Design an enzyme around this catalytic site. Structure first.
Site: not given
Length: 738
Positions: A425, A427, A429
């Site tokens: 994604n 970010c 994670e």
């Protein structure tokens, strides 16, 4: 000069009364150094008549806080003034505010524009008494200034530019927004939120109990197929998601390289760059209006357009070869990393000439890729290290691309049974499956890890498990309440029901326990904390499966075979929890959720709770928060120094002179020095190793920033390869330097 009081009445500005109000908040403070009249003096200076008392209070709090460098009790007094104001601002009855929010009429439109959903209001009104009196307004006073200001700017619903919601009102709104008629569950969640044990992600805090609620706002997409129709279908998707303020990770490797034949038009492809410019400008355009949407582009390093991809974010360039509003990530096969370190050749391919490389991982990939090489289906071969250098050059210049290990991600996914996972994604994670029919969604919350340490420097593992179970249940209800921007997102969430529980205040929990970040004690606590989170989460998920049945695609998954995350890392857990007993419950009922744990960045919400971000060491012992700018010392360290009688003006100066380091200050005892090492003084390999150890209990991944003060190729190489060899799924989110 006149102040405008809250009641709108005009009052004469008086030295004695302003001083007087400050005085009443000085209980227990060192009056030999703290002088109320000192604040009044600086406030009255730059003060024009027409100012409101709320403005006056804000000024007085901000002034008290610049006097922290005269005595630390001034910083406490500043919070006391802010909180005093917060109490005055926190209509008193919850259901009243909910009516005011619902009954809102836009003034320059004349249109009834409810700020909360009717069905929420209805539930609230049906349960007025229980709900209104469950609220503890003294909990509004539990924040620090900078947390409050973050809440005040974005999170408390405003009527015509004036804040109408107390923090407690917002929290109860969220709670009813999640639980509706289950008032028992709503009150349990409200208590947990208001006592700061955990928090829901910003999207949920913003929109819970509102119309068309956007409760999850991170997404992942794979490019449909390699055609103008596919490319522009996905673009519409990203536009629609971005309109709902969704962040996105997009896999792009299936798209033809530059120079590749187009059989239809008898022409040649422009490749990734010009296409990514369309996505870049879509990100700038659909930014919710007036303020840019955030898309992370994922590319596998066998792709022929890799070198140009590695340049798109460089600030020095050529405009038409730049896409500086996108974010960039590599989705890396083990084969690449093995060719780099053995100094072999790397083949660059066009996915049209060499199809299905993104649909295949591990040994299957290496086999498919090796036969394409043998068949001479290769566009360009470079030494693998040449591409490696381009990667590290890009990171030295921009801090990116992010580093994700495709085989690690896939080999250790419980979503393995769905097909190959093509990307992560925004970010880094989340590791969730995407396809033509499926856009993956991130449903997120974080536990406040500092809250579970007791007055006796012990860690309350039972409490952590019990709170986690509520979080699982809440996020699972969010899956069904959520308004989805595209139907492929709805399909995906309803089928596999993933969730992502993360953390904040890891550093605070180490410090509260008196553990250095790198100590044996912290490394063992780190495993224990994450074992616990994984254990409670599985247990809640199992309970929901008993009550509601497993998720659609449960049969065939690793957990349905009795394989949990640590089995995939070949790790044996500590003796803290009985995993054999949990496995036996899972064999009985299954689980409600395909994935559970995913430590995200907690930028906004960690600031609200006053915790250090995520799994991260304190990056400095002295830092600034912008509101004017405010100087902040690490609150744990400042207490230690003041308790010992070591703190003074020049002592703060010397730490700033040391870039927020305390290592070379001779008056500080060595046990304090090791407690309060900055991220720049902590071994990044140790950070990587601690992430891998907690990693065995995280069924998704973790947004891991890496901090190298003065990088070179040797530093970046050895850290990346260390992270890879640890088995990490995300080797690096951002690279931070100085």
């Amino acid at each position: 000069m006149h102040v405008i009081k809250r009641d709108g009445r005009q009052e004469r500005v008086m030295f004695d009364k302003i001083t007087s109000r400050i005085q009443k908040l000085c209980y227990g403070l060192n009056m030999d150094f703290v002088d109320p009249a000192q604040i009044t003096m600086k406030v009255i200076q730059g003060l024009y008549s027409g100012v409101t008392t709320v403005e006056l209070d804000t000024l007085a709090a901000e002034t008290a806080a610049t006097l922290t460098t005269k005595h630390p009790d001034y910083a406490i007094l500043a919070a006391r003034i802010a909180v005093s104001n917060l109490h005055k601002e926190t209509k008193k009855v919850f259901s009243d505010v909910m009516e005011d929010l619902y009954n809102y009429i836009n003034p320059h439109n004349g249109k009834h524009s409810p700020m909360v959903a009717k069905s929420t209001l209805d539930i609230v009104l049906a349960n007025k008494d229980r709900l209104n009196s469950a609220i503890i307004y003294d909990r509004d006073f539990s924040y620090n200034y900078f947390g409050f200001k973050t809440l005040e700017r974005s999170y408390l619903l405003k009527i015509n530019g004036k804040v109408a919601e107390r923090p407690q009102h917002m929290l109860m709104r969220v709670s009813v927004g999640i639980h509706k008629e289950d008032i028992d569950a709503a009150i349990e969640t409200y208590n947990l939120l208001s006592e700061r044990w955990f928090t829901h992600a910003s999207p949920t805090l913003f929109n819970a109990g509102t119309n068309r609620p956007q409760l999850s706002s991170c997404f992942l997409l794979s490019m449909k197929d390699d055609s103008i129709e596919g490319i522009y279908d996905t673009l519409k998707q990203c536009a629609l998601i971005s309109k709902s303020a969704g962040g996105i990770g997009v896999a792009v490797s299936c798209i033809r390289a530059t120079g590749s034949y187009i059989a239809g038009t008898n022409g040649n492809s422009n490749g990734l760059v010009p296409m990514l410019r369309v996505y870049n400008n879509t990100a700038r355009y659909v930014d919710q209006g007036g303020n840019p949407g955030a898309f992370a582009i994922y590319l596998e390093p066998w792709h022929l357009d890799i070198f140009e991809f590695l340049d798109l974010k460089k600030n020095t360039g050529k405009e038409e070869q730049r896409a500086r509003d996108l974010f960039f990530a590599l989705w890396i096969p083990d084969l690449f990393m093995k060719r780099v370190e053995t100094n072999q050749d790397w083949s660059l391919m066009c996915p049209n000439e060499c199809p299905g490389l993104d649909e295949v991982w591990g040994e299957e990939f290496e086999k498919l890729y090796a036969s394409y090489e043998k068949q001479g289906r290769v566009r360009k071969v470079v030494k693998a290290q040449q591409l490696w250098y381009a990667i590290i050059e890009s990171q030295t210049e921009t801090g990116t691309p992010y580093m994700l290990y495709k085989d690690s991600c896939n080999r250790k996914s419980n979503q393995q049974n769905l097909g190959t996972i093509k990307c992560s994604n925004l970010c880094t994670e989340i590791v969730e499956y995407t396809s033509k029919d499926e856009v993956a969604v991130c449903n997120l919350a974080s536990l406040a890890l500092n809250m579970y340490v007791t007055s006796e420097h012990t860690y309350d593992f039972k409490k952590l498990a019990e709170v986690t179970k509520v979080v699982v249940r809440n996020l699972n209800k969010i899956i069904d309440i959520n308004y989805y921007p595209v139907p492929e997102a709805c399909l995906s969430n309803k089928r596999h029901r993933p969730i992502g529980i993360g953390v904040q205040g890891l550093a605070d929990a180490f410090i509260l326990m008196r553990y250095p970040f790198e100590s044996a004690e912290a490394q063992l606590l780190n495993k224990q904390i994450f074992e616990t989170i994984y254990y409670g989460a599985l247990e809640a998920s199992c309970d929901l499966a008993k009550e509601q049945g497993p998720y659609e695609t449960y049969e065939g998954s690793p957990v349905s075979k009795g394989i949990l995350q640590y089995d995939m890392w070949n790790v044996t857990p500590t003796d803290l929890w009985d995993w054999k007993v949990l496995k036996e419950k899972i064999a009985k009922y299954g689980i409600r959720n395909s994935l559970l744990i995913a430590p995200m960045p907690t930028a906004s919400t960690a600031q609200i709770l006053g915790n250090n971000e995520s799994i991260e060491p304190y990056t400095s012992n002295i830092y600034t928060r912008r509101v004017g700018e405010f100087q902040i010392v690490n609150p744990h360290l400042l207490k230690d120094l003041t308790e010992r009688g070591l703190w003074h003006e020049e002592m703060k100066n010397q730490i700033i002179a040391c870039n927020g380091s305390i290592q070379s200050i001779p008056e500080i005892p060595d046990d304090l020095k090791q407690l309060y090492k900055t991220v720049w003084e902590i071994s990044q390999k140790t950070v990587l190793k601690m992430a891998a150890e907690r990693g065995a209990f995280i069924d998704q991944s973790q947004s891991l920033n890496i901090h190298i003060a003065e990088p070179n190729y040797g530093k970046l190489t050895s850290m990346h390869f260390y992270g890879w060899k640890q088995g990490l799924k995300t080797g690096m989110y951002y690279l931070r330097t100085r």
